Amino acid sequence: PKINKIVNGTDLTPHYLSEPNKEFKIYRYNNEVYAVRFENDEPMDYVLMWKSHKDYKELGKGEQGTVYEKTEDKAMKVSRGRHPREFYEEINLHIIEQQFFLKYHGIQEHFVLGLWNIKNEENVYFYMPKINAIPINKKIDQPKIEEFVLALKELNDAGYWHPDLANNPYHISPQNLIATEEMVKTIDLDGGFRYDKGRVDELSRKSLVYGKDQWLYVYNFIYPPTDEEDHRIDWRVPIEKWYENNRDESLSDNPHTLLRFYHEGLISLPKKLAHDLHETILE
Ligand SMILES: O=P(O)(O)O[C@H]1[C@H](OP(=O)(O)O)[C@@H](OP(=O)(O)O)[C@H](OP(=O)(O)O)[C@@H](OP(=O)(O)O)[C@H]1OP(=O)(O)O
Numbered sequence: 001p002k003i004n005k006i007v008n009g010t011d012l013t014p015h016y017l018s019e020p021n022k023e024f025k026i027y028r029y030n031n032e033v034y035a036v037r038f039e040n041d042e043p044m045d046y047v048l049m050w051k052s053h054k055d056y057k058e059l060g061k062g063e064q065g066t067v068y069e070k071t072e073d074k075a076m077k078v079s080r081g082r083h084p085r086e087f088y089e090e091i092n093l094h095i096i097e098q099q100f101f102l103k104y105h106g107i108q109e110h111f112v113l114g115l116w117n118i119k120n121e122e123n124v125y126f127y128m129p130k131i132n133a134i135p136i137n138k139k140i141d142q143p144k145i146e147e148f149v150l151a152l153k154e155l156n157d158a159g160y161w162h163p164d165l166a167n168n169p170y171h172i173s174p175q176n177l178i179a180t181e182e183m184v185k186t187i188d189l190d191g192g193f194r195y196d197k198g199r200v201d202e203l204s205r206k207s208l209v210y211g212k213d214q215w216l217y218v219y220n221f222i223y224p225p226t227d228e229e230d231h232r233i234d235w236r237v238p239i240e241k242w243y244e245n246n247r248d249e250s251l252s253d254n255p256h257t258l259l260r261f262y263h264e265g266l267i268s269l270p271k272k273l274a275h276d277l278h279e280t281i282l283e
């Protein structure tokens, strides 16, 4: 019911996307900034981007930017890079499409996407919902991490992956996982998700394999398999040997591999995935 009301809001598209635009528009409607997509010259669907309140406080800093608190509900990242306006416009278009993917899979809440403001080409910044981190307990809050991992797997299964969360089985960036009251979210997505572009060099092919199994690396790093002696198993050894001997293939594309390794005690799996896989056999 809101689509026709949202398009009557304030059009912010020139501050984010190329103008004119046939496919996507940005509107502020009742203190909420939406992205609206079009088909056949008609508004079709929308996604929520952030809440609007239309020497900043520093929320944090990484290698490639500084994140400020624009409002109590919105964060603002200033990256160290220099690119043309069209570079950010293209990222924004892909982020909007990726936001729609997240909505259509019911996992938008687990990822903090946003848009690059480009109304000043020399003062570019990334708006996004501000989240509030709280303590992590691996046992008491295990469902939070489980639910995030399964959401990330849904992303990986579709060919998208986080650009800086778990690049390979030996690299994890836990700082990009944030626990809130209800769940775990992931940040540092101002470039959008990664995806394969059809390239066949060695690096690209390995990155695709690592990305599709990203969800597995995160889960096993936090909840590695345990043997009789309560000693953690190095899940990386069987997985690496598998990649070396099954070229250009991911474990996620082979559920029989996941179940076999899980049955042998080599890898861990979220409780619901183990249950679903085992239920697939009983039935
Ligand atoms: O009038 P605009 O050109 O559309 O810019 C406004 C303005 O931001 P700036 O003046 O700093 O550029 C608002 O800030 P206020 O002075 O009204 O407080 C801000 O609203 P927030 O307070 O929530 O930051 C809003 O941002 P939003 O997109 O969330 O509505 C943003 O609009 P633009 O996105 O078009 O820049």
Ligand SMILES: Nc1ncnc2c1ncn2[C@@H]1O[C@H](COP(=O)(O)OP(=O)(O)O)[C@@H](O)[C@H]1O
Binding pocket: 059, 060, 061, 062, 063, 064, 065, 066, 067, 075, 077, 112, 128, 129, 130, 131, 132, 164, 175, 176, 187, 188, 189
């Ligand atoms: N949406 C957000 N809400 C609250 N804090 C954030 C948000 N995004 C980033 N931060 C803070 O800024 C820090 C740096 O974030 P960022 O630069 O995006 O990732 P990285 O440091 O991994 O490159 C984070 O560790 C976090 O504390």
Ligand SMILES: [Mn+2]
Binding pocket: 061, 062, 063, 064, 065, 066
């Ligand atoms: Mn950074």
